[PDB]
Symmetry: C2
Subunit: 36 residues, 2 copies
C-alpha cells in the first residue's frame, strides 16, 4: 500500500464498494413497488 | 396509478438520489490518494 496505509486504502476501497451494493437495494424495493 | 402514496414514492426517490451524491464525494477522496 504505497499510498495511505493499506488498512485505510482497503477500508476506503472496500467501503465504497459495499456502498454500491446498498444503493441497488434501495432500488430493489422501488422496482417491485412500482411494478405493484 | 402508482403503488404507495405519492409522497411515499417521492421520499424514497429523493432519498435514493442523496445516496448517489454521497458516492461521488467518496470517489473524490480516493482520487486524491492516487493523485500522489
Amino acid at each position: 500500500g504505497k499510498p495511505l496505509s493499506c488498512e485505510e486504502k482497503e477500508k476506503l476501497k472496500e467501503k465504497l464498494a459495499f456502498l454500491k451494493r446498498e444503493y441497488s437495494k434501495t432500488l430493489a424495493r422501488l422496482q417491485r413497488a412500482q411494478r405493484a
